[model samples]
Structures are given as C-alpha cells and as structure tokens.
Target chain A: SGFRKMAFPSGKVEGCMVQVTCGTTTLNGLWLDDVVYCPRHVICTSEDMLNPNYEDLLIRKSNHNFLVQAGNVQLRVIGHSMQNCVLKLKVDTANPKTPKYKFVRIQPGQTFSVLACYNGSPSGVYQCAMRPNFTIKGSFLNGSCGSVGFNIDYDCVSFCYMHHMELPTGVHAGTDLEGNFYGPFVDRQTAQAAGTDTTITVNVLAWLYAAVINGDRWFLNRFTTTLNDFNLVAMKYNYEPLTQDHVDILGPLSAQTGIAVLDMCASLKELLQNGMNGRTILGSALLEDEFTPFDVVRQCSGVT
Target chain B: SGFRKMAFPSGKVEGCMVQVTCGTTTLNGLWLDDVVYCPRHVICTSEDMLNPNYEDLLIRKSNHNFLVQAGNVQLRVIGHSMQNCVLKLKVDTANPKTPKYKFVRIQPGQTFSVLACYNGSPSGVYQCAMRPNFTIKGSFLNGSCGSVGFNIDYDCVSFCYMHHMELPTGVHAGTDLEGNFYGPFVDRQTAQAAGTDTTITVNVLAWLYAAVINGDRWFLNRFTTTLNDFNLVAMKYNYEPLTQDHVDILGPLSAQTGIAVLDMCASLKELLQNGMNGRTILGSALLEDEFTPFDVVRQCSGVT
Candidate 1:
C-alpha cells in the first residue's frame, strides 16, 4: 500500500502529536471516515527561518511510563535546524514510572534505523494502533519552507501488551491499563528498584531476555546453553522476536555458541548463502512476526 | 574448468563406449593426459543418412550386470534417426546377473533429468571417474548430417564404492571387486531372490534407498518416521544423499511426514520462499553432496 500523508488534529504538531515521531502514527478509527489516513507520511510543515529560541522544537517527552512501538522511524530537519537546533528521539524502556532514556540524535537527510525495543510502550506516546511488522517515517520540515506543519509516513504493526509474570514474594507489582508492570523496570532496573540486597524473579527466559529485550553483550555469556534451548525460547515467544536484525544484533554472542541461535536463523543463513535473488523475506512471515514457510513474497521471476 | 573434446580411442561410438550413453563418459587414464577431458559434452558425431540397417546406431547395452552412474544425461537424434531408429537409454539396477531394466525412449531435442541411483554401481559400466553431481549430454547425428564421427560433453563428480553390510546369513551373499554386493538386484528382485520366502538383510536404510536410489511412488509409504530419523539417515551417508532432486522425489513422502525431511529441505523451502533469485543451491554442497550452509552459488546482486 502507498504511504498516505499524516494528518495533524491540531494546526501545529505538538503534545501527543510530538510523541508520534517515536512510534507508529497511523490513526485507525472505528469507521471508514476514522480509518482514513496515510499509514506512512512525511512531516511537510511550512515555516520561516530557523528559531534557536525554541529549545525542543518538536518535543516527544519520553513515555517513561509505557511501551513505545519503536519501528523503522525517521526525523529530519530541512536547513538551519541542523546548525541551530538538534532533532532528538528518546528511547525509553518499559519502566513507566522511573524509566531510563537513550536519546538518538537526528539531522537533515538522516534516518533512524530502529532496532526492536525490549518493551516499546506507546500508550500516550503513539497516536494510532501499533500493528506487527509496522514502520513509521516522519519528517518535521519547518522553518523558511512554509507555515508550521508536520507530516508522518508510517506502516504500523500491532503488539499485544498482555503478559503475566510472577515475582519473588517480597517483590510485588501491579499492572497498568496497558497490561505492563508498574513497579521495577524488567532488566537492569529490576535489580536496581527491588533493593540491591533483595532477589527478584522476572520469569521470562534469560536467554530470550538478552536476545529480544536487551542485548548487554555480557548477558549472553552468563548462560552456556544449546540451540535447542534457543529454539524453545523462540517457540515460547510465538516467534515474534525472530527479526533478521534481532538475530544479527545477537550476532556477536550467537557466533560464540558456534551454532545458529535458532533454526530460523540457520534457514536465513542458508537462504542468503544459496544465492537467492529478487525474493524478499516477507515482513509478515519470517521477519518480526511468525515464521511461516507458506507466507512468501515472490517478485517477478523471483525465488522465495 | 573448460571442457575438452572427448577422444574416442576406437574413433567410433560403440562397445564399452556405448555404455557411456547411460552414465558418465569421461576417460581418466591415471595421468595428466588422462585427467584432461571434457566432463560434460554434446556428441558432435558426423554421419550420413539414418540407415535402417543400423538397428542400434548409438546402442548403449543395458548395464544389467552392475551399477550405472546415471546423471543429467541426454541423447538427441538430429536427423531421421527419430524417423528411422529410436535412441534408447536403459535404466538398470545392480542385479548383476538377472537384473531388470526400464528403457527410456529418447528423440530429437530432449533432456534426461536424472534423479539419484539407489546403488549407482559404476564398476565397468561408466568410462570416466563417476563423481558427485556430474552431467553428460550426447547427440548422434547421422543419416545425411555428416560423416561418421562423435564427441561427448560432461561434468563429472566422484563417488566412493566402499561400504559394509551384514546380511541375514540364511540368504547368503557375496561382494564384487567394487565393494557392492553381487546378489539379487535389491528392490523387487530382492524379494524375488531367496525363494520369495526368506527375509533378506541388505541393511541399507530403506527410507534413503527409496529417496536416493529408487522412488517407486508407493515405496515411501512403507515407513512412518520423523524428520529426526530422516536427518540421521542423511548424516549416516555424509549428507551425500541430500540432493535437491532426491528431496523433491521424496516430496510425496516428505509431505506425508508433515515436516522437512532434513534441515536442508526446510532451508531450501525458506530460501525459495524469501524471493531468492539468481541463487543456485550449489551442486557441490546442497545438491548431491554434503550440505554445507556456506557453499552458496550467488549471482551478482542475488539473494542466497
């Protein structure tokens, strides 16, 4: 489907609109009238010259309280903004209350190559539904071009927020409306918030956590496991975490095992080795979703 | 490697030379001169009008006595041979004595797509070194085409002839110099020998025999096993039996298993599924030999 222009509810892109830059921006309303809008678009806002007076010209206050669906997103400045002000995208964990942030800087003609988030919370941050295998690209081109405006280009994918976890008796937590925890942020923060002396149990498999949630380099070294164990973990996750980039991100550690992290990983490696051309590993099947052998995307005279 | 013209020691295509039509046709004489010859060829034999007197002009006597390295072979009749005498290819199993044969009819402009042989015993049957993944094409043009002459085109791959087996003593057996046992040609004739009452022990895995040697449509239904067992059989044979054609021949059985017979099968499926163009599952690796993920045949800008 072709990318549509992102419509702004307000005359100027601000507030929750600003958060659209972090996650997907497709607004799927109930009716056809509501559902109508471009799933992907560019921020083509007209304005005068650069104004250093505006600190966070397009501020997306970190959604420190929820998951943000961070997909292939982009933010670019037209001319003087690169010189005067810097465009920023703050990557937040699912900590909700006391979340840590990793700010990625953006400039003119630059793209944000997004890796999967451990738990991307887009509650108040994203304006539309975040579907599976989705991508959102936005450009806030303002200043000397025209009146202030922003357009977003996006292809959104859904992420189910409901997941249950059991913690050690001493560490009790509650779930928010979005089905995520309100207490200690799962990874490093879990250890931090639950008192350094207390033990916390986040039962999601450690191997998968390191692979899908956070790849801390040394985290994988903690476990000496087999490919079967990795495959089991993938099965547990419904294979949603089997993205090529995710597997690649674990490349350094995956290589250490002297085995593919998963059979899908091995298949991808074999496919790449077999000299397959004009075939796309469809985003729906083998990408960041279920790995179905039947859902293939073949080009003209292409091999899939 | 460039293909050299096949020099017929007899200067005419006949005798043991006729057997070349059914199997690999390169002559390896144990020296540089011996090793230098086209492993693949198209017989550029010059001849006059198709003689009705010449019953078997390019006759290749059925190798009913030993194994034949049947590969991608072709026999074409350029002129009136198709109108006069038929070009014939006899597929024989390793019966040695009372071997059965299946004659394949060939005519003008036709290709013989070779599947695998259950026990391709090339004892005195083939001319050159019967290597893995070999191909040979021959064309005899006579009867108003040219003077009497012939040439061969080929690409040869090596195959080992040594393997051990423990037969059920009741049905005694003996081995030939080529290491293959000389007994009842092991399929239907297997039961035919031993008086049709005794149980025989050829000992070669039946599933593989069905896939690599003979795919007789109903043969695969004899077993109900898992992919793991199939993989074990492939591993037992050094993965040499993992040819794409062999796997494809077992498609009916493989599909019945409701799983990929081997990981390579799954990999090929996934690679083909992912728009892989300009990529060939290399013959040396994934084809008729060992299955290595690294041995990929990729074209420029191709996906393997």
Candidate 2:
C-alpha cells in the first residue's frame, strides 16, 4: 500500500487519488472504478480523517487534492483541500452546460461511486458551484468538456489568425507568461441571434492541436462547430499539449547546409574520440540522406 | 379585352402588385397570367392604347386574367394590350413583405409583365390618371389574398387559441372583421431566423384558399404564421374550393337501411291550425302515446 495521486485533464482517472490515504491500487489486485463513502463515525477508526484540519495543502493546482475515479469514471471532487472535511463534487456525469449537475454530499461511507476525491476546491477543476443558497463556490467537473472546434464559416487564413489574436502560442505567434488559453468558447447561448454572432464553443485539445501544427482556426472553427457537442473531443491526440522547443532539438545543424554537412561528416569523422577504423563511419550517427548534404554541396563547390 | 387589374402581397411582383392592380373573375375568353407591354408609339391601332390617359376601369376578377404556361402558375394581368391599344391592366402579382418592389416606367411595347399598376399610393384598384411628375392616383388589385392556416406546434386547444390572439378565423375560432390573415412572415431578410420561430417557407395558391372562406391584417397575421406557405393544399380532402351556402342539392341518400314495415297508417292528425288529417274523433282519439292533446289534458285534470 503506497500513496498515489492522479489528475484527469480529460475528466477520467485510472484509479482514485489518494492524498491522505496511501493504499492499494486494486481491491484484490483489480483496479477500482468507484469508491463508496461510509459512516464517518465508524470507518475512520484509523483516525486519519479526525486528525487533519486545513493545513499546508493549498499550493498545488487545486486543493492539493486531485481528480480520481472509483471506476475512475463518474463522480469526483473539488481539489482545494487535501483533507477539508467539507468539499464539493459531482455525482453523475454532468456539467452545467451540457446538462447541469446536481449537488451531492457524502459521509464517510456512502453508497455513491467516487469519481474523484478532494482536499478539493472545484473552482477551476470543474466549475464555479452555485449552491441552493445562491452561493456559487465553483462548478464540479462533469468529465472533461471533451475537445471542441467547429469549422463553420471561414477560409483557413482567417480562422487561425482569429484565434491567434485571442491567445498567443500559435505557429505564427508566441505565448507570454500570461497568455494561457483554454477552450475556444467565447459564449454558450445556442442560437444564431443578434447576440450570437461571435459566440464560440471551445475545445481544449483541438485548440492546442492547431497552434502547434501551424493550422488556422477558421478551418478549425468550422470542423469543431459541426459537431453536436464539444465533449466528444478529448486530449485523444495529446495531453502533452505544449509546444515542443524545436530550436533545441534540431539546433546542432544550422550554421549553413554545406557547413552543416562538414559537421555531420566531422562528427561522423570522429564517431568515437578513438577514431576507430571500421567498415562504416559513425554508423548510427549517419542517416540515409546525411551524405547528400556533403555530396550536393561538394559538387556545388566544384570539389566533385 | 375590357379591363382588369391585380396585386402581389409579397412584393416580389416586379413583373406582376406583383400591387396595386384590381380586377376580377374573367375576360370574354381570357385568363390573366402575364401581360407583355407594347409600343403605343406605333402599335395600338385599336388606339385604345391611343385612347385614355389614366382611366378608372377597375372592378371584376377572372377571365380577365389567367395563370399562364410559362409554369407561371399564379397571377398575371391583361396582355393583348401589347398593341391592342386598348390595354387591360395589372401585369403581375404584388406582395408586401418579400423583396420590396420598385416602380418601373413602361413605354408602349415595353416587355415587362405587369402585376398591378401603382400610382401615388399602394392601395388596390387601377390608377385614375397619369401625371408625368408621377402623381398617378391609384393602387390596383389582382385578386384578394386567399385563405390560410397551418398547425405546427401544439395540441388543438393551444394552436387555436394561439392564433386567436393574432389572427381570428383559425380552424376553431370564428372570424371577426379582423381575421384576414396572410402569409406567416414579417421580415424576409430572407430565410428562417431568430424572431421567426420556425417560420414556414410558404408558396402561393394555398394562401388564397383561405381568404374566400373569409377572414384582416391582425387576423391575417396569425394564419400565415401557422403554415409554412399558402400554396393550396388541395383535394387532400373533399371540400371543394368554391362556396357552400345552405340550400338545395341532396339528390338522394345512399341506399339500404332496415326499413321493412308495410302499412297504410302513415298519416296522422294535423295538430292545429284548422288541420286536415286521417280523422279519429277527439273523443276516441286518446291512447298511451298522447292520442290527443285534449285527452292528455283531461287525464292530467283527473277526468279521464
């Protein structure tokens, strides 16, 4: 029994998050899809629940708590508190937009499936909650909003630039310390009324996909808008979601092409410091067209 | 021919009031669909074209005009005037809410199909005089807007009452002086849109079918909105499009019922007004079935 914690940017977790209680990933070695609560009065015989109040658990993205699931599917919680006895959560797979979620309270051992746990503040993790008393703490996650994009009306160049204006980090653009973009939704009222022209139904995955691939939002907006719902999309392509620093990875070869050839060949010239005499030089270092650089440039330089 | 005129309410009546023409029923042998304009400069030998400036020959509805074969299924005004010199009127249909109509100046031998002739205003009936400064005095008529009603969203009670608030004369409601409903549209920026809750895309004929049944702008407004268009729904059922006042015309009833009684006792006493009848003295004329009113009265008086 060890401690494990997980986050579901996609609204699903492989197993439950265990911040306070480190335990087995499996029941009998089979992973759990859900965790029912129990009588707080009796089940906490371990006293862990009784010992903790609110302490140094607020530094993480959320309440230091994370999204988890019993089946890792349905219910989950806010993440503001690692052990805040009181927390907000979602029971059914629901959200305020698609289908508004209802509020639920759980005791130590309740019969509901645990979608996630919380020392949680659902603030950004799920939603801004609106309780019966009219207080909106935050919304609960209803699974991930899924990816969304609509390629409705636009030529390609127009779309990408449009999104670029909203959030930096596109192929033609760059991001700033504060330019973090989320879903593409600007508004969510479902009609083509005077008030609805520029409204957007955003999708996280697709938005990221466009930025890095040099794609544009005009084409992207249309493709995504045609769908019935945005949730159908997921980080299916990637949750790595950030732009990889291409300059770092492909940096070693840019002095000049022939100059580039002189180098790969030079590196191949001395694959090993020992410069061993072998059947092939720099065997692994040489890729198929590596010699083309030397061959083309040499001929061009009249050395052929 | 003599004279005729028409109006298209949707205003797409460019070639047709496509307003302001008014005519009726028929011509000696003509139906009004399209009227090609002509060169009064050299053609109208009848010189009727050579005749009047702006004369009032309005009134009348039919052979006066006919729907032609150009697949021009609806209204058009008098033609032979091409050179008949004595031109009949209302070249095309005129409507109000569709694309707005523009005024055209037709010289003799003009090629445009006239819907209705307009003047200082857009009312119905032919122009009374031609003022070059453009002060002609009249709006003409083609025919009247026809009947209309369509049931879309609701239970019968809801549908009927809903229209009651706008146009009267819904299937269940009685038509007041205001029930003259037309097409179910207001703005045709052109297509189904925001304020246009599922507005129907309407056609012609059907719209006319409703008017003869009799209904007004206030009332007209609702009926048009109910159906997508007014093209006649036709013999879908068996009530003819013409009139139906209560009077003679039931030749016979279908044969075969259970009538097998043979007797000579069909006649009975003519109850009052010095009547003539199969006699039975008022004395012996009393039976269980009220043989006589006198007998029944006597018995009621306790003197039987």
Candidate 3:
C-alpha cells in the first residue's frame, strides 16, 4: 500500500518528512517520497522548508539529523534532514569487534533501522556515525520502522524551536501554510494560532518536564523544575499555565526501577549485560524525539 | 515433578472441569492428568469441586502459574492461575525491590499477568484486583498459540483428542468432547476422518467463498492480489503450513516484529507519554520485538 499519515502524540517526524536545519534556516516536508534510505529529498521544494525567512536556502545539503536509536540488537539511523547525501554509518563497539558499517539514505527526518552486532555484547561499548559525506537518490514512502524503522521522542520540533531560540521555557515552533517555522512561543496558543505547531510544543514541554523530573541534575534539574530554574526566568515570558498537560505527564514520571546501574556496574565491575552497544544512546537528547534504551546509559554508567 | 491436570480451553475449566450448560447436568473431569504448565499434573483428586454443582471450594490449596517474561526494564508476573488466593507480590522501583501480590486462585480456566516495578522510572500504574475473572491456560497443550512448542498437530494425539475437532469459518473456538466452543465450524475441517484438524470445513466455506473477492472492504482491491493477503496472514499465523516451521522461526515471525506497548506511545507522543508502565509493550508484535538501545534500541543502541 501507500504511506499513511501516522499521528504521533508529540513530534512530527515519522519516516515521512525530513526536517533540515543549518543556521537560522530549517526546512521540513516530505523528503522520503521515493528513495527511502538514500538521504536525498526525493520530493524537494523550498516549500518543504517551514520558515519563510530562509525559504529558498539549499539547507538539505548541509546539516542533517544523523541520529541513532538502539534496540535489543539493532541500530536505527535517521538522516533527519540530509539531502542528496549518502549516510556512511559506522558502528564501532569499543570493546573490540570490527566496526559494522552501512551505506544508507535518510532524507532528513527519514529513518532506517538495521540489525547490528557490536564488540562481544551486553556492554559492548559501540559508536556509530552517519557521516553525510556520501551520495544518494531520493523520495521514499514508509511504514513501521522496526529493527528497521527509526528513533525517539526526545521530540524534535520543540527541541529545534528551543534550541534555535535557546529558550528554557516551552517555546514550540511550527510552520505556516507556506511551511514556515512559526514561533519560539511560550504557550501553545500563539504557536497554534497561525497554523503552527503548538501540539508539538506542548508535547515537547511535557517531555522536557519528564526530563526535568528524571534527567541528570548537572544537565537539567536545577534548570527545569525549580521555579527559579534558568528557564523559569522566562516562565512568564511564554505565559504558560501553572500546570500544563505535560505536567500531569511528569507527575507519573517515576525513576526507572530494576537493577541499579551502579549495582549493574558494580556487578560488571564487581560482578554483571548483552548484544547491546551501550553507545547507541548518544544523540542530541532534545534534537530527536524518542529516547532509546541507551537513554538509560547516561544515568547508569555514572557518566558524571 | 509429577504431572497434575489443570484445565481450561477445549473444556470449560480443566481444574474446574467445564461446567457445560449443555442441558445442565454439569459434569467435571480430571483435565490435568500429569502436567499442567510443566505439562505434568502434579496433583489429583476429584475434591477440587467448588460447590456440589461446583460453586465455592479451594480448587487448589496451593498453586500458581508463577510465570515470568522479562523485558529490558521490568519483570512481568503471571499467576497462570491462582485459585482463591492473593499473590503478595512486591516490586521496588525504590529500595530493595520484591515480588509480592495475590490474585487468589486461577481456575483451570483463569489467568493473571501482574506488573511490578523494580529498580524505576515511569510510574507503575496498576492496582491489584486480579479476578479469577480471566481464563484460558495450558501448554496451550492444545490449540494454535504459536509456531513452536509441542504442537496440536506437531504430533497431534500425543497431545489429546481435543485439537482434531475441525470445523469451518473463523474456527477459533475450542473443540468437542466437552460442550464445544468449537469454531464457526468454518475455519477448519477433518483432514481426519483418520480424524484430524486439517479437515478444512464449511466455515472454511465462508472464507472459501470470501475468496470470491471483496472480503475486507478497505483491504482487498482485487481477488487475485487479495489471495496474496490471505497468504500473508497465513504466512504469519501459521508461519508455514508444514514441518518446515518458522525454522528457528527466522523464516519470518521471528523477534524483529513484536510488543511492549508503553514504548509505542512513548515513541509517538514525545511529551505526555506513558507512566512507569514501560511494561505494557509486553505481548506479541514479532517483528520489532527484543528492542534494546544497546542495539540502538534497534536490537539493543551504541549504535556507532
């Protein structure tokens, strides 16, 4: 069959569109019209770019979201926004197995999930690079990206909005009928008014809220929930509600249970894991949407 | 380990031998002769009657399906059947976790899957109220559960006469001997006057006639092409119609495409996602099963 529109609760990258950003210019649209894993925008037009300001820039050939998500024994790569580029993905398990590589295509937001084997397993510290230094054809339709699909709701739209605006508050940006990134709007109302992405913003805020509750202290906590946190400086800036939909979401955010990473590390160190690279968790935590199991690694390995 | 007969499925209740409303002389039998879960019924006695008509009685003074299916972050508890007793299960997403719960007793017909949070992130959202309210338990010594395990036809009779009861249509019901919940009598038939399940039936007639075309409105476009869809369904449902098997199951229905729902929602809605109930995606999805970030969450995620 043909590709169907899948409704995501938050971000809008489902192996369908590729959002590319370079500098202040970010564009998004159906990048996977024909060639799926080929990293080139099959159906490209300046119309795909969401911000009218940089509407005509050739942002596709620049920076791409070469993101990776880990599974039980596979690596999913998304060429978040690459254009006419071949992603030369290399996964290296630092423990010592030979690096596994794939020549894949991910048109910006497009993704490809591939089975992987890393150095020995469980703790086979691995690394992968989706170097956009390659070539490709374009346009691809999609379906579920299984051990073959794609990555997380670590939520991209909000992330890009937040990152570009460098905001600590809930600034979700969307596009216009002309496909333009709307705002670093604080509340979702304004973002949605001009036919933008407030839904994504609220969702991003919710995810960040979860992160605030569960993220590494040095990186986020003080800046998140603390009414006086860094972003709190801008709370009134966005005029958000006292408690947003994501707040309730954060309420249920409990710490991950089961074997403690310390205990596991102790077990591994003093004593303990599988066919996992342990490194697949690396990526812009906010830039992508879904957090992989590796999302647990940063906390467990005691990276601090 | 001696074999004890615990029942359900083909019969109303093995442990609680089917209370067939056939005419009303509800009779019971020794369903578990030797093995129940272990395939051997360890205990026996007709004293398991709940009431004279079989109303209320301690079916088993002691027993449990006490089964476990572990995923990346949590442990799943299933009291295949706990008759009249609550399982005191304790899972600590906090300090020193434990498994303590109670769902009373599972009728030879009941089942229970309890979730406990150990070590944790994501709120463990569930209250313990396992009613003997559920049913169906066995090796499924019995029907068509999967592509493996001693089969119903794997070597039929060694199993029991229950399976050979072929009918037609969505013949998904249990068999004869007892007051058959038997099929629409449409799905299968008697490949066996020698007597076997292969006896494709009249209900099969419905499907056979269904092959005339226009089966599922939105799905089938052409009959010739749609015959292919039925084949695809069979490809997965049975894996293959012969001894060829899924062959270690790799032929298809392997681990790649599978379950654990918390994940799916989490992936879609970036912000307002699931509770600590990361345990939801626990059932059968087959294609994307066994996700691990270590694989990049693809197989496990170091991705590189």
Candidate 4:
C-alpha cells in the first residue's frame, strides 16, 4: 500500500516586527489564522470574525473614543484627527498587483482598529506601521511639551530588535548568529551538504581504516580523494536533498564502522570542551584504528 | 600554574590481536613464550649454544622450553611438540618490504610452542602458525615414503587458523580471516566520489543545502556544476593523495544560516534509518528550517 501526506503549515511570517511595551497588549501572532469577517453592513457581535495580523501589529482599542458598534455602519473612521498615523489593508481583489496589505499609521498611545468584511478567503497578511510623537518635558524648556517625530522603517525594526532585545539565554533551537548549526546531522545527504555552495561530503574514513589495516597506500590515496570529493559535493549542495542515486552509490562505500557519526561528534565536542583540538579527535580515532593492524600479529598473519 | 599533563601507556595494548591453539598432547600447564632465533644458523635448538653463527643479530634465551640443552643449543622451545610437526612463527613489521625473521620447522611431535627471547618490542608483532607435514605411503617396490609438501604460507596459515582453530575469544584480542581484529571499514571518501566528477563535493553539497532551504534555484544549478567538477577531480586523483587543503574551500561557506548542513545530516540519518526518502528528509530539514524562521523571531524578540 502506498501512502502520502502533505501539510502546508503557514509559510514564514513575512515583514512583521513585534515591539513589546511595559503593559500587556494583544499583538497579532506571526502566524495567520483563518477568520470569517462580517459583511459590510451586516452586524457581527462575535469577536472571532476579525482577520489575523502580524505579531508587530497591536490593537489598542482603549486609547480611541470610537466604539465598535454591534452593526457595521459604513465601517469608516476619521484617522485625520490623529497626527502622524497611517493605516493599510488588503481590500482589492481584481488587481493582484495591488499591495496585499499596507502600513497605515504610527502614533504614541493612540489606537486604531479596522472592521473589514472577509469575502472569499481570509488567509492573507495585514499590518500597520506606527510612528509615535513623543512629548518630553525638560527644565530648559520650562516644562513645555515638545513633539519629537520618528519615522520607522523595516530595517530599523530588524536591526534594533536584533541588538537590544533580551536574547534567549539557553542554547538556541534554530540557526546561530551566522545562521549555521553545529552538527549531529539528520542524514547522510544533509550532513554532507549543509551549507551554501557545499556538496555532500562523503568521507572514506572507513576505507582509510581498511587501507591502514591492509597497508595499501593506493587505497588510502583513493579513499582520501573520495572524502575530498564528498566534502566538495557537500559544499555545493549545502546540506540539501541528496538524490537516491547519489545515496545508492555512497551508502555502502561510506557505510559507517566503529561509532555513529553523532557519537563521533559528541566525542569531538567533549574533546573541544576539554581544551583539545577537535580535529585531533577525529584524526586520533582514524589513526588509532589504523594502528590496530600494526599492533596485532594477526593482522600480518594473512599477508604472505 | 599552567601545565599540561598527558599519559599514554606504552606497554598497555590499546589495539592488538592475538591467537592461540591447543595441541593433542598436553604438556601440563605450559605457556607459550616469545619466539627467538639465530638469524645465520637457519636452525634453532634448545641445547647449550657452543658456536653462535650470526653476529650483530640480537638473541636472548628464556626458560619455557622442555628441552633446554639439546644439541649444544639453549633456545627455549615453548609448547608441547608431537612427532613430526612443524612449528611456525608469524612475524609482523611496519616495513612491508623487509624479510620476516621467523620460520616453521618440523619437530618430533604435533605439539610445539613459541620460543623465548622475542618480546618487549613496542612496534613488533609476533604470533604462531603450526602445520604438520607427514610422509604418505606410496605403492613402490621398496615401500618408500612419498614426500608431501605442507602448505605453510602465512596467508594460508592465517586463513586456516582464523576460521578453523578453536581458541578463547575476547574483545581487543583474537584474529579474523582478514587479519583484522576489528571488522572491515566502509570507506567514506570512495563513497563520496563515486557519483560526481569533481573533488569539491562538500562545497557542492553545501550549496545544494543552501539552495533547498532558501528556495534558490540558481544555487541548485551551481551545485550541480560543482558536483560535476568534484567528480572530475575524483577521476583525476583516482590514485593520488587528496590533502586537506585541496578541499579547504568548503569550510567557510558551510558556516552560513539557512544552511543547516549538520542538522540536515542528523535528520537524514534518522529518516534513512526510518526508511524515509532521502529527498523527503532533505526537503523537510532544509526547507523547514528556512520556512520557519524561528531564529528570526528570537532575534526580533530580543530587540523588542
């Protein structure tokens, strides 16, 4: 029996920046949830009909005097009254070129909410950009309130968040600062090609073990080349999908002996932690295995 | 006080192989000693030595031989020897081109032992290979015995003894048919280069992984080209050394984000063991890491 499964989990949260303040506020989560909006003139008392927005887009209803009535009345609001505030939404269906969403407004301690009816599918991104005017009272100004204007951009949000926010203290679950993961690869292909311009590295370390045991220099050289090639391939693919044909060729040839690659990695980590060269750990394992043939009388017993 | 202490036991056998056999005629709890010989004489005896033939060749006598003073020789005969049996000594040396010192000589009985005075060498290997040669009766006018040659080649001896000889077995000790105490190796290098034409396989794999994760088709094409190059290099260096520097280009590129090479490997191995498709494993690890952007969220959180 053949079986298959497919799941389209929400794609990456795009172009959303979540900025948290001192008070608890309900910011839109990065992921979008399917919601059914009420028709333009229809009354919808249920709050579940609201469309989803990004985590950075906060809904501050308390700051505004306007009330969301039980029935939709033109679904319009006077945003000109608030200074330096912009509002954006995905409303057009005919033109795919139309911006799916817009950044509407930015204000300090000011709230704005939209009541839009969902027509066909409520699976889209909606966001708002807020630039608040801050009033600072200083002794030099005799306690006068002066407006400070700030224009926010996506780059500022990304960089600011990256630098100032408290970093998660434990080990990171995802990529590192440079966006790479230390090993314990999930598969041969992934292990080999886990980076940009990287090909799957197929090491002939086992072959080297064989060569050392048999004292075959030719085999050793060949094995080394194979490993080098594997490394190159890994670099090229950058730990991407390894074709079945590739695996078929490499599987038996690169079949693991001694310990698993993960165990080897752990040993490497331990060695590094103990102030030892991680590369040496790998080299020593190879050499120690090689030395076995020379140390044992039985290894040469078969050689005529 | 910055000092480093390291210890590696010299005499303690880390990786070695040994083999032993019992004879039909037991000699009352006698143990095998090291094999010793007078290089020039071409023959060894257990009697008091009157005229030593060889010079500059080291020889030491130890007590273990039952016949201590036979024919003016003082060489120790190690084990019990039955009638008309040849005692064989297997010699292992690092230099493959050198002549082996030991030989097999026919004795009085099937029982024979390792000689004394051939121990304490850190880089030498020694073992026993016994074969009994007997005359076969032939139909002749005078009832003469036919000379039947006993196949005592080290290769034949090792193979026969490894498979047929009954002896105590333990980890770190004993011999197999390949003369390997450890099992055979699966050469990683060979596996890596079998499919591609270039030597830079790791580099290619890294690109592939990156391309898959970032949804970059251009990188994928480049990976294919690099893989071909790797295959070419492999073909060129089929019988040559591949130094580490040869594939050094793969190192830096693999240390990128959205290119979880190591994670991909780990996931791939798990999936392969679980009998999942190689492509599926790669897609999930690489694409999933790219699509989730969990690291982005973490970074953004810190900024907020």
The runs of at least 3 residues in candidate 3 whose Cα sits more than 4 Å from the true structure, single-residue gaps closed, are: A1-38, A42-60, A63-85, A89-304, B1-58, B61-65, B71-170, B173-304
- State the fnat of candidate 2 relative to the true structure: 0.00
Q: Model 2, range B184-275, lDDT digits (tens) per residue?
A: 32211123221211111111111111111111011111111111111122122111222111000100100111111110001111111122
Q: For each candidate, what is the lDDT?
A: 0.22, 0.18, 0.20, 0.20
Least accurate 10 contiguous residues by lDDT in model 1 chain B: B28-37
TM-score of B-chain for each predicted structure, in order: 0.18, 0.15, 0.17, 0.18
Error of 2 at A302 (Å): 64
Model 2's number of clashes is 138
Off by over 4 Å in 4: A1-206, A209-229, A234-304, B1-304
Residues A1-304, model 1: lDDT tens digits: 1010111111111111121222322211000111111111111121311221233432322333111222232222111111111222233222122212121221111111111111121110111111121112111111100111112222111122111122332222222213233344331112223322210111112132222222112222322333555445445434333444444544544454343445334443343234223332210111221111111111001110
Q: By TM-score, is 1 or 2 better?
A: 1
Q: Give candidates' CA RMSD values in order.
A: 28.1, 37.9, 25.4, 31.5
Query: What TM-score against the true fold does each predicted structure earn?
Result: 0.15, 0.12, 0.20, 0.16
Q: Top lDDT: which candidate number?
A: 1
Q: Candidate 1's fnat? A: 0.00
How far residue B255's Cα lies from its native spot in candidate 4, in Å, is: 51
lDDT of 2 at A186: 20
Better of 2 and 3 by DockQ: 3
lDDT of 4 at A45: 18
Using TM-score as the yardstick, the better of models 2 and 3 is 3
Runs with alpha carbons beyond 4 Å of true place in candidate 2? A1-184, A188-304, B1-101, B104-304
- lDDT string, candidate 4, B92-156, tens digits: 22212222222233321111111111111111112111211111111011000010111112212
